Amino acid sequence: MEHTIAVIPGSFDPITYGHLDIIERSTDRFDEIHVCVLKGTFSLEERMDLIEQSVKHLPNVKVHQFSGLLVDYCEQVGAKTIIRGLRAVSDFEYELRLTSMNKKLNNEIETLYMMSSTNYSFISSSIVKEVAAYRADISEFVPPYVEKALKKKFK
Amino acid sequence: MEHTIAVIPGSFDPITYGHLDIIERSTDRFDEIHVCVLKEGTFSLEERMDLIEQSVKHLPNVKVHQFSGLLVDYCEQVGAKTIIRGLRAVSDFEYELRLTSMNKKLNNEIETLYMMSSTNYSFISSSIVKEVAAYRADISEFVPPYVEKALKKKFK
Amino acid sequence: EHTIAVIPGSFDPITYGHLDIIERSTDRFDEIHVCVLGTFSLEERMDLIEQSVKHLPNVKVHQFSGLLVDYCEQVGAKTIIRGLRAVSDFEYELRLTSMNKKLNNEIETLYMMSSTNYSFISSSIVKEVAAYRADISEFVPPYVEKALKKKFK
Amino acid sequence: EHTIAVIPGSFDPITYGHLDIIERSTDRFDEIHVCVLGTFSLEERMDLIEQSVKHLPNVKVHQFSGLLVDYCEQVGAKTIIRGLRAVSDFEYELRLTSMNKKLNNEIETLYMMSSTNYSFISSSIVKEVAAYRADISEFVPPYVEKALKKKFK
Amino acid sequence: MEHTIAVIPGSFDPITYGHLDIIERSTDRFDEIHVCVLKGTFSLEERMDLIEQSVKHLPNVKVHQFSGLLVDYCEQVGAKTIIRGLRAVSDFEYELRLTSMNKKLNNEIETLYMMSSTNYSFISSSIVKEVAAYRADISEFVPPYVEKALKKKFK
Amino acid sequence: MEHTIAVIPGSFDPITYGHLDIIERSTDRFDEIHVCVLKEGTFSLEERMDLIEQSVKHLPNVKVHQFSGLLVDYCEQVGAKTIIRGLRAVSDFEYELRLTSMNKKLNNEIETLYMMSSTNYSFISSSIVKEVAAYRADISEFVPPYVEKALKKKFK
Ligand SMILES: COc1cc(OC)nc([C@@H]2CCCC[C@H]2C(=O)NCc2ccc(Cl)c(Cl)c2)n1
Ligand SMILES: COc1cc(OC)nc([C@@H]2CCCC[C@H]2C(=O)NCc2ccc(Cl)c(Cl)c2)n1
Ligand SMILES: COc1cc(OC)nc([C@@H]2CCCC[C@H]2C(=O)NCc2ccc(Cl)c(Cl)c2)n1
Ligand SMILES: COc1cc(OC)nc([C@@H]2CCCC[C@H]2C(=O)NCc2ccc(Cl)c(Cl)c2)n1
Ligand SMILES: COc1cc(OC)nc([C@H]2CCCCC2C(=O)NCc2ccc(Cl)c(Cl)c2)n1
Ligand SMILES: COc1cc(OC)nc([C@H]2CCCCC2C(=O)NCc2ccc(Cl)c(Cl)c2)n1
Ligand SMILES: Nc1ncnc2c1ncn2[C@@H]1O[C@H](COP(=O)(O)OP(=O)(O)O)[C@@H](O)[C@H]1O
Ligand SMILES: Nc1ncnc2c1ncn2[C@@H]1O[C@H](COP(=O)(O)OP(=O)(O)O)[C@@H](O)[C@H]1O
Ligand SMILES: Nc1ncnc2c1ncn2[C@@H]1O[C@H](COP(=O)(O)OP(=O)(O)O)[C@@H](O)[C@H]1O
Ligand SMILES: Nc1ncnc2c1ncn2[C@@H]1O[C@H](COP(=O)(O)OP(=O)(O)O)[C@@H](O)[C@H]1O
Ligand SMILES: Nc1ncnc2c1ncn2[C@@H]1O[C@H](COP(=O)(O)OP(=O)(O)O)[C@@H](O)[C@H]1O
Ligand SMILES: Nc1ncnc2c1ncn2[C@@H]1O[C@H](COP(=O)(O)OP(=O)(O)O)[C@@H](O)[C@H]1O
C-alpha cells in the first residue's frame, strides 16, 4: 500500500531506553518514523541532539521539532499515525484522554499504542534523572551518549 | 513497505459495533486484515464466522478465519507480523498487558498494537448486547442489521 | 412520593455493605425500592431484606421480571442508587450506566461511596467466612446472621 | 427548596463536562448551588458560570470562604454532587469524601458518571487546545468560547 | 527477637517461578516459611508434591495443607505473618479485601506483600497452563519437575 | 534470626496517624525500626524530626534519622535489609511498583515489604490534614496531640 509515516511524540527529557524500545519496535512497520518534540532539565537543542545520536543506527528515523498541535504536524508531514507507549494504568487513562481529544482535533489521524517491554516498564526520564542526581549507575537505562550527558549535568 | 497482514483475534459471540470500530479503523493501515476466531457460548463457530463475514463484506481486504493453535502460530503461518486489539478500560488494559508479555516470549517477531475504542462504543461487549437482546430492547445502535436479525431470533 | 430511588441487587444475602447504602438513601427521597432478581432462593432473599429494613418506614422490597430501567418507569422512579467500593466496582458500573442511559435517557444512576468500615464486605466473602464458622455479627444484620448459621452451621 | 444539592469546583473555566453534571442534576433537587473557590479570576469564573447556566432557573452560583461542608450546613444542603470520568477521579473523590464524612456526617456526596461524549473534557485540556487556536465550540458554551478566544486569541 | 514463622498461602495449581520468587525472597527474613495449601487441574496430593520438589533446596521451607481459615492455621502453628505477592492492580484490590477481612477474623496476624520481580509480573498458574495446553515451551516459567508434570498433563 | 533493622522512609510533613499505623504495626516484627526522613514544604526538617520523635517515643525500638543520598545506601550503611511502605490505593500501588523496580536494580539485597493501611486511616495524608487544619476543623482524629498542637499554631 501507499507510503506510510508514523510520528512518535515526546518531550524526551532525556530520551531513555524506554523511548528507544518503542522507536525501534516501530521502524519495521512504517516507511518512515518521525521523532517529534514540541517547540525541563535539558534544553530543546540538547534534547534534539540526544535523540539524533541515540537513533543514528535506524536509518528510517528522522528527528524534528514543531510548535503547534501534534495532529497539525502530522497533517503537514502526511503522517496518518501517532505511536505512543503504555507502561501502566496511569499512562493508560492519560493516553485515553489525549486520544479522545486528538480524534476531535483531526479524525484522520489514528493513535496506535504498544506496551513497553518487561524490562523497561519502570523507566521514565524522571526516575533516570533522579538516579543520576545521586550518581548511581544508569548504563542499563539510557544509551551511552545520553549516559555521558546526564553525568555531566548532575556532576 | 512490503505486503502487511494484521490479525484481529476474538471470540465474536457475536460481533458488535465495538469490534467493527476496530476493524474499520485498521483496514486502511495494512494490505490485509484477518479476523481470527478461536477453535460453547451462545452462537456456534460457523454462525460466528457467518456473522462476521456479513458484517465486514463492505470492506475491501478483510478475511475471516478460524484456528486451533496459538494465535502467534497463526500469525507465523499466514505471514502476519501484527496483532491488533482494542482497549476500552483499565481492566482490558491489565489483561492485555499480561497476554502481550507472554506472546512476546512465544514469538518476539510479532507485535501487538492497540487502539482506544471510540467513546461511543467503549461500553459495548458481546455480553451486554445479549443481555439487552434477551429483554428485547432495541439493539440497532449496538450491532449491524445482519447480527441484529440473528440476536432477535435467538431471543424470540 | 414526589421522588422514588431504586436500589437494585442480587442480595444473596443482604449485608451491612448493602444496608449502609440503603440507610444513607432513606432521608434523600420520599421512597426507596430495593429491587431484586445463588445460595438463597428469591423468596428467601426478599424475606431477609424485608426483615433487615423494617426499621426504615419508607423502604419497600420488590422483584421484577424485565429491565431495571422499565421498573423505574413503571413506578415513577427517576433515580437508581448504586454503592461503589473499589476501582473494579467503578469500571463495571460505568459500563452498566452507559447502557442504561441508552435504554432510558430519563433515568439517572447516582453512586455513593461505601463507608470505610464496610468497603471490603460482599455477599460472597460473608458466605465464605460463614462456611468456616467465623463470627459474622459485624458483617450482617441479626436475621441474616441466623440464616447464614442455619445454612452453613 | 425542601432539597438543595451543591456542585463544587474551580470552574477555570466551566466546560460542557461541568454543564453535563449540572443539567442532569436540576430536575432532581429543588435548587442547585454551583459553588466556587488559575487562568481566570474568581470574578471572571463566576460570571462565566452565571452566563452558562442562565437557562436553568433553579441553579444559583456562589462563592465561599470556608469548608464545603460548612457551606452546605449554612444553606441547608444535605447533598454534594460530583462527576466521575475515570479511575483517577474515582480514587481522588474517595479520599475527599472519606474526609468530608468525618467533618460532617450528615452531608452525603453523590456521584454521576460523566456522559460518554464529555468524559475526556477538563478545563486544562480545553485551555491547552484553545492556546493553539483549535475549534472549541464542542467543548465549552458560547460565552466561555468567547472568553477563551479573547484570552489566547 | 523471638522465633518467627511466615505463611505463604496459595492453591499452587501448579506452582510457578512467580510463586517461587516470593518464597525464595522470604526465606532469609523469617526463621521458618510454611507454604500452605487449602484442604483445579492438579489434585491436592499432586500440588503438594510439585511444591516440595520445587522448594527442596530451601531448607527452612515446609509444605503443609489445612482445611480451615488461614488465620486459624497461622494461629495453630504460631505464625504472626502472611506473605502474599502483588503483580498488578487487580491483585492489589483483591488482596486489600482479603486482608481487610483477615484483620477482622484475627487482628494479631499481619499480611506483608512483596512486589513480583520484573520478569515474573505476567506469569500465573493459569497462563502457564494455557501455554502448556498448546505445548509451547514453559521452561522459563516453571521449575523442571513442574515442567515435566505439565507436559504429561497436557500430552 | 540475626539482628534485623527495617527502614520506614518518608517526608512526614507532618507525621499522621496514617504513618503511625504502619510504624506501630512494624515495631514488633523487627529488632529495630528506623524512620528515615529525606535531606520546602510546611515544616522544616528539624521540626519534622521532632514531631516524629515525640509521636514514636512510646515505642521501644524506633529511631528517627535523616539522609542525604539514596535510601538503599542508607539501608546498606545501617545494616537494614528491609524497607517498609504502606499502601492505601491503586495510585499508591503503581507508584510504589515503579520505585521498588528501580531500588532492586540499585541494590538487590534490600527488599521492600508493604502493608495495607488500616481501613480507618486509608484516606489520611499529610496534605489533607494540613488542608483541614488551615480551616481549623477538629484534627484530633488524624494526628497525635504533639502534632495537633504544632498544626494549630502553624494555622493560627
Ligand atoms: C497523542 O500524543 C500527544 C502528546 C502530547 O504531548 C506530548 N500532546 C498531545 C496533545 C493531546 C490533546 C491536546 C493537544 C495535543 C498537543 O498536540 N500538544 C502539542 C504538542 C505536544 C507534543 C508534540 Cl511532540 C507536538 Cl509536535 C505538539 N498528544
Ligand atoms: C493478544 O491476543 C490474544 C488473545 C487470546 O485470547 C485467548 N489469547 C492470546 C494468548 C496469550 C498467551 C497464551 C496463549 C495465547 C493464545 O494464543 N491463546 C488462544 C487463542 C488461540 C488462537 C486464536 Cl486464533 C485465538 Cl483468536 C486465541 N492472545
Ligand atoms: C490472605 O491470603 C488469603 C488467601 C486465601 O485463599 C488463597 N484466602 C484468604 C481468605 C481471606 C478472607 C476469607 C477467608 C480466607 C481463607 O482463609 N480461606 C481459607 C484458606 C485459603 C487458603 C489457604 Cl492456604 C488456607 Cl490454609 C485457608 N486469605
Ligand atoms: C521505596 O521508598 C522510596 C521512597 C522515595 O522517596 C523519594 N524514593 C525512593 C527512590 C526510588 C528509586 C530512585 C531513588 C530512590 C531514592 O532513594 N530517593 C530519595 C530518598 C532518598 C533518601 C531517603 Cl533517606 C529517602 Cl527517605 C528518599 N524510594
Ligand atoms: C444499574 O444497575 C444495574 C444492575 C444490573 O444487575 C445486573 N443490571 C443492570 C443492567 C445493565 C444494563 C443491561 C441491562 C440491565 C438490567 O436491567 N438487567 C435486569 C435487571 C437487573 C437487576 C434488577 Cl434488580 C432488575 Cl429489576 C432488572 N443495571
Ligand atoms: C467533595 O468536594 C470537595 C471539593 C474540594 O475542592 C478541593 N474540596 C473538598 C474538601 C476535601 C476535604 C478537605 C476539605 C475540603 C474543602 O472543603 N475545601 C474547601 C472548599 C473546596 C471547594 C469549595 Cl467549592 C468550597 Cl466552597 C470549599 N471537597
Ligand atoms: N497527568 C499525567 N498522568 C500520567 N502521565 C503523565 C501525566 N503528565 C505527563 N505524563 C507522562 O510524562 C511523560 C512525559 O511526557 P511526553 O511529552 O508524552 O513524553 P516523554 O516522556 O518522551 O518526554 C510521558 O511518558 C507521559 O505519559
Ligand atoms: N480480567 C479479565 N480476565 C479475563 N478476561 C477478561 C478480563 N477483562 C476483560 N476480559 C475479556 O473480554 C473477553 C471478550 O473478548 P475476547 O474473548 O478476546 O473476544 P471478543 O473480542 O469477541 O469479545 C471476555 O471473555 C473476557 O475474558
Ligand atoms: N465484573 C464485575 N465486577 C464487579 N462486580 C460484579 C461483576 N460481575 C458481577 N458483579 C456483581 O455485582 C455485585 C454488586 O452486585 P449487584 O448487581 O448490586 O448485586 P449485590 O449488590 O447483591 O451483589 C458484586 O457483589 C458481584 O456479585
Ligand atoms: N490528584 C487529583 N486527581 C484528579 N483530579 C484532581 C487531583 N488534584 C486536583 N484535581 C482537580 O480536580 C478537578 C476536578 O475539579 P474540582 O475540584 O471539581 O474543580 P473543576 O471541576 O472545576 O476542575 C480536576 O479538573 C483537577 O483540577
Ligand atoms: N477475583 C479475583 N481478582 C483478582 N485475582 C484473583 C481473583 N480470584 C483469584 N485470584 C488470583 O488467582 C490466583 C490463585 O489463588 P491463590 O489461592 O491466592 O494462589 P495460587 O495462584 O498460588 O494458586 C492468585 O494469584 C489470586 O491473586
Ligand atoms: N502518582 C504519584 N506520583 C508522585 N507521587 C505520588 C503518586 N501517588 C502518591 N504519591 C506520593 O505520596 C507522597 C507523600 O509520601 P512521601 O513523600 O513518601 O512521604 P510521607 O510518607 O511523609 O507522606 C507525595 O509526595 C506523593 O508524591
Side-chain angles (χ1 to χ4, degrees), chain B residues 9-15 19 38 85 88 91-92 94-96 99 125-126, chain C residues 95, chain E residues 90:
Chain B
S11 41
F12 304 100
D13 187 38
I15 196 178
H19 310 277
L38 335 61
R85 299 284 277 166
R88 324 142 170 190
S91 50
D92 302 302
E94 295 217 304
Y95 173 68
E96 290 301 320
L99 299 180
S125 54
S126 302
Chain C
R95 285 176 295 204
Chain E
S90 59

PDB file of all heavy atoms in Angstrom, chain B residues 9-15 19 38 85 88 91-92 94-96 99 125-126, chain C residues 95, chain E residues 90, ligand 8:
ATOM      1  N   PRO B   9      -7.910 -10.833  16.566  1.00  0.00           N
ATOM      2  CA  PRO B   9      -8.417 -12.014  17.159  1.00  0.00           C
ATOM      3  C   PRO B   9      -9.609 -11.768  18.077  1.00  0.00           C
ATOM      4  O   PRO B   9      -9.797 -10.659  18.561  1.00  0.00           O
ATOM      5  CB  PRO B   9      -7.201 -12.559  17.904  1.00  0.00           C
ATOM      6  CG  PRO B   9      -6.480 -11.320  18.363  1.00  0.00           C
ATOM      7  CD  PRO B   9      -6.780 -10.256  17.315  1.00  0.00           C
ATOM      8  N   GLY B  10     -10.417 -12.774  18.309  1.00  0.00           N
ATOM      9  CA  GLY B  10     -11.510 -12.643  19.276  1.00  0.00           C
ATOM     10  C   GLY B  10     -12.403 -13.853  19.295  1.00  0.00           C
ATOM     11  O   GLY B  10     -12.275 -14.722  18.455  1.00  0.00           O
ATOM     12  N   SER B  11     -13.369 -13.912  20.217  1.00  0.00           N
ATOM     13  CA  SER B  11     -14.455 -14.889  20.092  1.00  0.00           C
ATOM     14  C   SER B  11     -15.685 -14.422  19.278  1.00  0.00           C
ATOM     15  O   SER B  11     -16.380 -15.272  18.735  1.00  0.00           O
ATOM     16  CB  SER B  11     -14.906 -15.383  21.488  1.00  0.00           C
ATOM     17  OG  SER B  11     -14.936 -14.281  22.325  1.00  0.00           O
ATOM     18  N   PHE B  12     -15.997 -13.127  19.256  1.00  0.00           N
ATOM     19  CA  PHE B  12     -17.057 -12.532  18.415  1.00  0.00           C
ATOM     20  C   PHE B  12     -18.362 -13.256  18.572  1.00  0.00           C
ATOM     21  O   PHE B  12     -18.867 -13.834  17.611  1.00  0.00           O
ATOM     22  CB  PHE B  12     -16.634 -12.529  16.911  1.00  0.00           C
ATOM     23  CG  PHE B  12     -15.311 -11.818  16.635  1.00  0.00           C
ATOM     24  CD1 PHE B  12     -14.148 -12.529  16.470  1.00  0.00           C
ATOM     25  CD2 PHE B  12     -15.228 -10.458  16.646  1.00  0.00           C
ATOM     26  CE1 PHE B  12     -12.929 -11.919  16.292  1.00  0.00           C
ATOM     27  CE2 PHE B  12     -14.002  -9.807  16.441  1.00  0.00           C
ATOM     28  CZ  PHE B  12     -12.853 -10.526  16.270  1.00  0.00           C
ATOM     29  N   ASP B  13     -18.911 -13.232  19.787  1.00  0.00           N
ATOM     30  CA  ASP B  13     -20.086 -14.037  20.156  1.00  0.00           C
ATOM     31  C   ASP B  13     -21.244 -13.181  20.583  1.00  0.00           C
ATOM     32  O   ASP B  13     -21.694 -13.219  21.755  1.00  0.00           O
ATOM     33  CB  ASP B  13     -19.721 -15.057  21.228  1.00  0.00           C
ATOM     34  CG  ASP B  13     -20.835 -16.043  21.534  1.00  0.00           C
ATOM     35  OD1 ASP B  13     -21.567 -16.487  20.587  1.00  0.00           O
ATOM     36  OD2 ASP B  13     -20.953 -16.419  22.734  1.00  0.00           O
ATOM     37  N   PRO B  14     -21.794 -12.388  19.638  1.00  0.00           N
ATOM     38  CA  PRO B  14     -21.496 -12.103  18.263  1.00  0.00           C
ATOM     39  C   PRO B  14     -20.639 -10.808  18.188  1.00  0.00           C
ATOM     40  O   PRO B  14     -20.515 -10.043  19.167  1.00  0.00           O
ATOM     41  CB  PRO B  14     -22.884 -11.761  17.719  1.00  0.00           C
ATOM     42  CG  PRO B  14     -23.437 -10.874  18.807  1.00  0.00           C
ATOM     43  CD  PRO B  14     -22.933 -11.560  20.101  1.00  0.00           C
ATOM     44  N   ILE B  15     -20.090 -10.596  17.013  1.00  0.00           N
ATOM     45  CA  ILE B  15     -19.504  -9.349  16.635  1.00  0.00           C
ATOM     46  C   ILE B  15     -20.472  -8.201  16.878  1.00  0.00           C
ATOM     47  O   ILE B  15     -21.676  -8.301  16.643  1.00  0.00           O
ATOM     48  CB  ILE B  15     -18.968  -9.421  15.167  1.00  0.00           C
ATOM     49  CG1 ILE B  15     -18.011  -8.255  14.887  1.00  0.00           C
ATOM     50  CG2 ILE B  15     -20.124  -9.571  14.177  1.00  0.00           C
ATOM     51  CD1 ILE B  15     -17.355  -8.194  13.515  1.00  0.00           C
ATOM     52  N   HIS B  19     -16.447  -4.131  18.079  1.00  0.00           N
ATOM     53  CA  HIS B  19     -15.422  -4.888  17.299  1.00  0.00           C
ATOM     54  C   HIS B  19     -15.204  -4.252  15.918  1.00  0.00           C
ATOM     55  O   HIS B  19     -14.055  -4.077  15.451  1.00  0.00           O
ATOM     56  CB  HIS B  19     -15.829  -6.352  17.080  1.00  0.00           C
ATOM     57  CG  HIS B  19     -16.254  -7.091  18.301  1.00  0.00           C
ATOM     58  ND1 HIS B  19     -15.354  -7.668  19.177  1.00  0.00           N
ATOM     59  CD2 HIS B  19     -17.478  -7.425  18.764  1.00  0.00           C
ATOM     60  CE1 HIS B  19     -16.005  -8.287  20.137  1.00  0.00           C
ATOM     61  NE2 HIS B  19     -17.295  -8.178  19.900  1.00  0.00           N
ATOM     62  N   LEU B  38     -11.411 -18.260  17.527  1.00  0.00           N
ATOM     63  CA  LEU B  38     -10.766 -19.409  18.225  1.00  0.00           C
ATOM     64  C   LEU B  38     -11.474 -20.776  17.947  1.00  0.00           C
ATOM     65  O   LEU B  38     -12.690 -20.848  17.943  1.00  0.00           O
ATOM     66  CB  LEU B  38     -10.696 -19.220  19.773  1.00  0.00           C
ATOM     67  CG  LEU B  38     -10.687 -17.853  20.484  1.00  0.00           C
ATOM     68  CD1 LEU B  38     -11.943 -17.034  20.206  1.00  0.00           C
ATOM     69  CD2 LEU B  38     -10.509 -17.956  22.017  1.00  0.00           C
ATOM     70  N   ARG B  85      -5.598  -5.125  18.737  1.00  0.00           N
ATOM     71  CA  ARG B  85      -6.516  -5.301  19.835  1.00  0.00           C
ATOM     72  C   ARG B  85      -7.062  -3.908  20.222  1.00  0.00           C
ATOM     73  O   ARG B  85      -6.350  -2.889  20.106  1.00  0.00           O
ATOM     74  CB  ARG B  85      -5.783  -5.871  21.025  1.00  0.00           C
ATOM     75  CG  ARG B  85      -5.142  -7.238  20.804  1.00  0.00           C
ATOM     76  CD  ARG B  85      -6.183  -8.338  20.815  1.00  0.00           C
ATOM     77  NE  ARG B  85      -6.519  -8.771  22.191  1.00  0.00           N
ATOM     78  CZ  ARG B  85      -7.567  -9.519  22.515  1.00  0.00           C
ATOM     79  NH1 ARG B  85      -8.430  -9.909  21.574  1.00  0.00           N
ATOM     80  NH2 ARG B  85      -7.790  -9.863  23.790  1.00  0.00           N
ATOM     81  N   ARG B  88     -10.706  -0.633  25.962  1.00  0.00           N
ATOM     82  CA  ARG B  88     -11.834   0.203  26.421  1.00  0.00           C
ATOM     83  C   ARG B  88     -11.586   0.791  27.824  1.00  0.00           C
ATOM     84  O   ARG B  88     -11.912   1.952  28.092  1.00  0.00           O
ATOM     85  CB  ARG B  88     -13.162  -0.599  26.442  1.00  0.00           C
ATOM     86  CG  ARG B  88     -13.398  -1.629  25.343  1.00  0.00           C
ATOM     87  CD  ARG B  88     -14.113  -2.844  25.944  1.00  0.00           C
ATOM     88  NE  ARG B  88     -14.601  -3.803  24.950  1.00  0.00           N
ATOM     89  CZ  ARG B  88     -15.413  -4.850  25.201  1.00  0.00           C
ATOM     90  NH1 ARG B  88     -15.838  -5.091  26.437  1.00  0.00           N
ATOM     91  NH2 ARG B  88     -15.824  -5.653  24.202  1.00  0.00           N
ATOM     92  N   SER B  91      -9.438  -2.375  32.928  1.00  0.00           N
ATOM     93  CA  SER B  91      -9.344  -3.840  33.205  1.00  0.00           C
ATOM     94  C   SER B  91      -8.972  -4.599  31.930  1.00  0.00           C
ATOM     95  O   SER B  91      -8.239  -5.598  32.004  1.00  0.00           O
ATOM     96  CB  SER B  91     -10.615  -4.373  33.814  1.00  0.00           C
ATOM     97  OG  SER B  91     -11.719  -3.944  33.029  1.00  0.00           O
ATOM     98  N   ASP B  92      -9.474  -4.115  30.788  1.00  0.00           N
ATOM     99  CA  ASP B  92      -8.905  -4.513  29.473  1.00  0.00           C
ATOM    100  C   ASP B  92      -7.407  -4.337  29.415  1.00  0.00           C
ATOM    101  O   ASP B  92      -6.686  -5.199  28.958  1.00  0.00           O
ATOM    102  CB  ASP B  92      -9.464  -3.684  28.313  1.00  0.00           C
ATOM    103  CG  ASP B  92     -10.951  -3.773  28.210  1.00  0.00           C
ATOM    104  OD1 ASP B  92     -11.457  -4.900  28.061  1.00  0.00           O
ATOM    105  OD2 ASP B  92     -11.611  -2.707  28.297  1.00  0.00           O
ATOM    106  N   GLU B  94      -5.016  -4.152  31.776  1.00  0.00           N
ATOM    107  CA  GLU B  94      -4.160  -5.034  32.577  1.00  0.00           C
ATOM    108  C   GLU B  94      -4.123  -6.452  32.012  1.00  0.00           C
ATOM    109  O   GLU B  94      -3.062  -7.102  31.997  1.00  0.00           O
ATOM    110  CB  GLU B  94      -4.615  -5.086  34.039  1.00  0.00           C
ATOM    111  CG  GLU B  94      -4.486  -3.749  34.782  1.00  0.00           C
ATOM    112  CD  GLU B  94      -4.060  -3.962  36.222  1.00  0.00           C
ATOM    113  OE1 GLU B  94      -4.787  -4.726  36.926  1.00  0.00           O
ATOM    114  OE2 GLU B  94      -2.979  -3.417  36.620  1.00  0.00           O
ATOM    115  N   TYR B  95      -5.287  -6.943  31.601  1.00  0.00           N
ATOM    116  CA  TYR B  95      -5.383  -8.258  30.969  1.00  0.00           C
ATOM    117  C   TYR B  95      -4.513  -8.328  29.680  1.00  0.00           C
ATOM    118  O   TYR B  95      -3.746  -9.269  29.485  1.00  0.00           O
ATOM    119  CB  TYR B  95      -6.857  -8.528  30.702  1.00  0.00           C
ATOM    120  CG  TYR B  95      -7.182  -9.751  29.900  1.00  0.00           C
ATOM    121  CD1 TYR B  95      -6.956 -11.027  30.414  1.00  0.00           C
ATOM    122  CD2 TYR B  95      -7.738  -9.637  28.624  1.00  0.00           C
ATOM    123  CE1 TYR B  95      -7.269 -12.145  29.680  1.00  0.00           C
ATOM    124  CE2 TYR B  95      -8.068 -10.767  27.889  1.00  0.00           C
ATOM    125  CZ  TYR B  95      -7.834 -12.006  28.442  1.00  0.00           C
ATOM    126  OH  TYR B  95      -8.140 -13.118  27.724  1.00  0.00           O
ATOM    127  N   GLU B  96      -4.601  -7.296  28.840  1.00  0.00           N
ATOM    128  CA  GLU B  96      -3.868  -7.260  27.545  1.00  0.00           C
ATOM    129  C   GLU B  96      -2.374  -7.204  27.763  1.00  0.00           C
ATOM    130  O   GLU B  96      -1.581  -7.685  26.953  1.00  0.00           O
ATOM    131  CB  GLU B  96      -4.303  -6.056  26.684  1.00  0.00           C
ATOM    132  CG  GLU B  96      -5.722  -6.171  26.122  1.00  0.00           C
ATOM    133  CD  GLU B  96      -5.987  -7.367  25.253  1.00  0.00           C
ATOM    134  OE1 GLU B  96      -5.117  -7.732  24.439  1.00  0.00           O
ATOM    135  OE2 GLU B  96      -7.036  -8.011  25.471  1.00  0.00           O
ATOM    136  N   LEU B  99      -1.181 -10.730  28.409  1.00  0.00           N
ATOM    137  CA  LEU B  99      -1.189 -11.504  27.167  1.00  0.00           C
ATOM    138  C   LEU B  99      -0.059 -11.148  26.248  1.00  0.00           C
ATOM    139  O   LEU B  99       0.608 -12.069  25.725  1.00  0.00           O
ATOM    140  CB  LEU B  99      -2.491 -11.340  26.409  1.00  0.00           C
ATOM    141  CG  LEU B  99      -3.819 -11.767  27.018  1.00  0.00           C
ATOM    142  CD1 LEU B  99      -4.973 -11.478  26.042  1.00  0.00           C
ATOM    143  CD2 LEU B  99      -3.754 -13.221  27.443  1.00  0.00           C
ATOM    144  N   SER B 125     -20.138  -4.755  24.659  1.00  0.00           N
ATOM    145  CA  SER B 125     -19.451  -6.034  24.650  1.00  0.00           C
ATOM    146  C   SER B 125     -20.512  -6.943  24.093  1.00  0.00           C
ATOM    147  O   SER B 125     -21.730  -6.654  24.249  1.00  0.00           O
ATOM    148  CB  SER B 125     -19.032  -6.530  26.063  1.00  0.00           C
ATOM    149  OG  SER B 125     -20.102  -6.572  26.961  1.00  0.00           O
ATOM    150  N   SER B 126     -20.071  -8.067  23.572  1.00  0.00           N
ATOM    151  CA  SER B 126     -20.992  -9.137  23.215  1.00  0.00           C
ATOM    152  C   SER B 126     -21.932  -9.475  24.380  1.00  0.00           C
ATOM    153  O   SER B 126     -23.127  -9.681  24.200  1.00  0.00           O
ATOM    154  CB  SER B 126     -20.208 -10.353  22.768  1.00  0.00           C
ATOM    155  OG  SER B 126     -19.383  -9.950  21.656  1.00  0.00           O
TER     156      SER B 126
ATOM    157  N   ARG C  95     -19.865   0.799  32.706  1.00  0.00           N
ATOM    158  CA  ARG C  95     -20.448   0.088  31.551  1.00  0.00           C
ATOM    159  C   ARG C  95     -21.964  -0.081  31.676  1.00  0.00           C
ATOM    160  O   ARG C  95     -22.683   0.168  30.730  1.00  0.00           O
ATOM    161  CB  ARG C  95     -19.823  -1.304  31.300  1.00  0.00           C
ATOM    162  CG  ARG C  95     -18.421  -1.297  30.682  1.00  0.00           C
ATOM    163  CD  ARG C  95     -17.839  -2.717  30.555  1.00  0.00           C
ATOM    164  NE  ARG C  95     -17.662  -3.245  31.910  1.00  0.00           N
ATOM    165  CZ  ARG C  95     -16.805  -4.196  32.288  1.00  0.00           C
ATOM    166  NH1 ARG C  95     -16.016  -4.824  31.405  1.00  0.00           N
ATOM    167  NH2 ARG C  95     -16.735  -4.519  33.576  1.00  0.00           N
TER     168      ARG C  95
ATOM    169  N   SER E  90      -5.194  -5.449  39.762  1.00  0.00           N
ATOM    170  CA  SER E  90      -6.317  -6.351  40.035  1.00  0.00           C
ATOM    171  C   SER E  90      -5.985  -7.204  41.271  1.00  0.00           C
ATOM    172  O   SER E  90      -6.885  -7.402  42.130  1.00  0.00           O
ATOM    173  CB  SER E  90      -6.610  -7.217  38.801  1.00  0.00           C
ATOM    174  OG  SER E  90      -5.477  -7.977  38.435  1.00  0.00           O
TER     175      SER E  90
HETATM  176  N1  LIG G   8      -9.738  -9.632  33.937  1.00  0.00           N
HETATM  177  C1  LIG G   8     -10.146 -10.332  32.840  1.00  0.00           C
HETATM  178  N2  LIG G   8      -9.974 -11.700  32.805  1.00  0.00           N
HETATM  179  C2  LIG G   8     -10.378 -12.472  31.761  1.00  0.00           C
HETATM  180  N3  LIG G   8     -10.934 -11.889  30.652  1.00  0.00           N
HETATM  181  C3  LIG G   8     -11.130 -10.516  30.541  1.00  0.00           C
HETATM  182  C4  LIG G   8     -10.740  -9.617  31.657  1.00  0.00           C
HETATM  183  N4  LIG G   8     -11.055  -8.341  31.263  1.00  0.00           N
HETATM  184  C5  LIG G   8     -11.618  -8.428  30.005  1.00  0.00           C
HETATM  185  N5  LIG G   8     -11.656  -9.735  29.577  1.00  0.00           N
HETATM  186  C6  LIG G   8     -12.173 -10.413  28.316  1.00  0.00           C
HETATM  187  O1  LIG G   8     -13.071  -9.833  27.300  1.00  0.00           O
HETATM  188  C7  LIG G   8     -13.480 -11.093  26.622  1.00  0.00           C
HETATM  189  C8  LIG G   8     -14.267 -10.936  25.335  1.00  0.00           C
HETATM  190  O2  LIG G   8     -13.199 -10.756  24.377  1.00  0.00           O
HETATM  191  P1  LIG G   8     -12.474 -11.971  23.541  1.00  0.00           P
HETATM  192  O3  LIG G   8     -12.893 -13.313  24.171  1.00  0.00           O
HETATM  193  O4  LIG G   8     -10.974 -11.685  23.205  1.00  0.00           O
HETATM  194  O5  LIG G   8     -13.388 -11.910  22.204  1.00  0.00           O
HETATM  195  P2  LIG G   8     -14.372 -10.731  21.639  1.00  0.00           P
HETATM  196  O6  LIG G   8     -13.275  -9.734  21.155  1.00  0.00           O
HETATM  197  O7  LIG G   8     -15.143 -11.428  20.545  1.00  0.00           O
HETATM  198  O8  LIG G   8     -15.302 -10.087  22.694  1.00  0.00           O
HETATM  199  C9  LIG G   8     -14.069 -11.972  27.743  1.00  0.00           C
HETATM  200  O9  LIG G   8     -14.023 -13.413  27.546  1.00  0.00           O
HETATM  201  C10 LIG G   8     -13.072 -11.584  28.834  1.00  0.00           C
HETATM  202  O10 LIG G   8     -12.260 -12.726  29.209  1.00  0.00           O
END
